[PDB]
Paper text:
Our recent discovery of meditope, a cyclic peptide that binds to a Fab cavity of cetuximab, can serve as an alternative, noncovalent method to modify antibodies, with a precise ratio of two meditopes to one IgG. We have also determined important residues emanating from the Fab through systematically grafting the binding site onto M5A, an anti-CEA mAb. In this report, we investigate the possibility of increasing the affinity of this interaction by reaching through to the other side of the Fab hole. Our recent efforts to characterize and optimize the affinity of the meditope–Fab complex focused on the importance of cyclization and side-chain modifications. We wondered whether it was possible to reach through the other side of the Fab hole by extending the side chain of Arg8, increasing the surface area to improve the affinity of the meditope–Fab interaction.
To test this, we synthesized a series of extensions of Arg8 starting with the addition of aliphatic carbon chains. Initially, we synthesized a relatively short, n-butyl extension to determine whether such a construct would make favourable interactions with the cetuximab Fab. We observed in the structure that the terminal methyl group is in close proximity to the backbone carbonyl of Gly112 HC (3.3 Å for the first copy of the meditope in the asymmetric unit and 3.5 Å for the second) and the backbone amide of Leu114 HC (∼3.3 Å); thus, we expected that modification of this group with a hydrogen-bond donor or acceptor could improve the affinity. In summary, increasing the surface area and adding groups that are capable of forming electrostatic interactions between the meditope and the meditope-enabled mAb improved the half-life of the interaction.
Author numbering:
A (entry chain B): 1 to 220
B (entry chain A): 1 to 212
C (entry chain E): 2 to 11
């Protein structure tokens, strides 16, 4: 199938440069152009540029002097590079492919790369259990979760039992604390009678700090 | 650049109802407009190309119309899974531009929240901080009040709230309120309570525990 | 306004 897979999320210092790799499969770069689109709080969706099959590049007007797109046909990789970043360049950056080689209707997107522009340092999170008890139990159903505290920057991924548990999972949006670090909780409801025989693990992954933690949550 | 104006920013409807999204262009663009769906934590999904042409794998309930400056994306029978943001894109003029987007919220029956409270772990207490979490699960509508009390003292300014996006399966919301204390302050007190207020409750619900 | 945490307008 047609897939676009972008490199991991990361922090970029003000005035420094941004670098993202788009690795594609299911088609050849010699046949299709790869587009680049970002999504900021300020300007929403915004077309940045494209590299065509022949290697030609078009950059949107405001980015013609600080944006560089390259590629490697044999490795099926596209390279995105932007210079002199400011705080409002903080956005999700996508690579994309159109329906046809020449067009602009984007049917295939990369998963996105959340880029944060700040002068701060990367910090990995601490993971604490939200233990189930009688005060998280309701009608044979128990709630339990993981507190993912004090990390920077966004994002963290959370899954449960390596993806085998998805029903009743809520992972809350991160909030920014006064410390300047983010914090987040992920909860799931399960039958209370399963707490004795099932193991529940939240899989926490903070790519910017390369922090991977599996936290087992159990009644206390 | 072409300016695309989507109106309104927010649409709220009941399931099974028909709904229409608007996209107006600052000048004529013929039928050179594409529509996108973006679900929570997702990338944009192509729905309609060139005003009305259908896309593979897209349900038949999605259709579009319009020409010139006035365009419309329609859903004949809206489902719970349609909860998302919708964007229009023009490409009659370089560079291609997108609208600001329209949000699709769904109505449903009033549902009271299940309230659960979680004391801090001993693990966190070792670091000198105590987080107490209050969970409001699967409720509607979104509006709720959470009030914290430590030994009958009303807390204020020391809690933070987070609300999930609308659930695409049952149209509910969930909310977490976290009370953050120092370990010392936490240890100097006994009764911890979050009182919850919501339309679905005939009286406030208080979940509480005693430290120890 | 677009939110980077959920990818949803708020």
């Amino acid at each position: 199938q047609v897939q676009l897979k972008q490199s991991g999320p990361g922090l970029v210092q003000p005035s420094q440069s941004l670098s993202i790799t788009c690795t594609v499969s299911g088609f050849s770069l010699t046949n299709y152009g790869v587009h680049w689109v970002r999504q900021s709080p300020g300007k929403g969706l915004e077309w940045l540029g494209v590299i065509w099959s022949g290697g030609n590049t078009d950059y949107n007007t405001p980015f013609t002097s600080r944006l560089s797109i390259n590629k490697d046909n044999s490795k099926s990789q596209v390279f995105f590079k932007m210079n002199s970043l400011q705080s409002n360049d903080t956005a999700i950056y996508y690579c994309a492919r159109a329906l046809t080689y020449y067009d602009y209707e984007f049917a295939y997107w990369g998963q996105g790369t959340l880029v944060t522009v700040s002068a701060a340092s990367t910090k990995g999170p601490s993971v604490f259990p939200l233990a189930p008890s009688s005060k998280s139990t309701s009608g044979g159903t128990a709630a339990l979760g993981c507190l993912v505290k004090d990390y920077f920057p966004e994002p963290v991924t959370v899954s449960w039992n390596s993806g085998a548990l998805t029903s009743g999972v809520h992972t809350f949006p991160a909030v920014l604390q006064s410390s300047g670090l983010y914090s987040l909780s992920s909860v799931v409801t399960v039958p209370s009678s399963s707490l004795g025989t099932q193991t529940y693990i939240c899989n926490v992954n903070h790519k910017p700090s390369n922090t991977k933690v599996d936290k087992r949550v159990e009644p206390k | 650049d072409i300016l695309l104006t989507q109106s309104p920013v927010i649409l709220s409807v009941s399931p099974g109802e028909r709904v229409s999204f608007s996209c107006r262009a600052s000048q004529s663009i013929g039928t050179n407009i594409h529509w996108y769906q973006q679900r929570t934590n997702g990338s944009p999904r192509l729905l309609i190309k060139y005003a009305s042409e259908s896309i593979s794998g897209i349900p038949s309930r999605f259709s579009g119309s319009g020409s010139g400056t006035d365009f419309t994306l329609s859903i004949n029978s809206v489902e719970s899974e349609d909860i998302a943001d919708y964007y229009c894109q023009q490409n009659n003029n370089w560079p291609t531009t997108f609208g600001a987007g329209t949000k699709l919220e769904l109505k449903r029956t009033v549902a009271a929240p299940s309230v659960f409270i979680f004391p801090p772990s001993d693990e966190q207490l070792k670091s000198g901080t105590a987080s107490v979490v209050c969970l409001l699960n699967n409720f509607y509508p979104r509006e709720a009040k959470v009030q914290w009390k430590v030994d009958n003292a009303l807390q204020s300014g020391n809690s933070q709230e987070s609300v999930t996006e609308q659930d695409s399966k049952d149209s509910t919301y969930s909310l977490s309120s976290t009370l953050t204390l120092s370990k010392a302050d936490y240890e100097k007190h006994k009764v911890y309570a979050c009182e919850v207020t919501h339309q679905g409750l005939s009286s406030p619900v208080t979940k509480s525990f005693n430290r120890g | 306004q677009f939110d980077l945490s959920t990818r949803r307008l708020k």
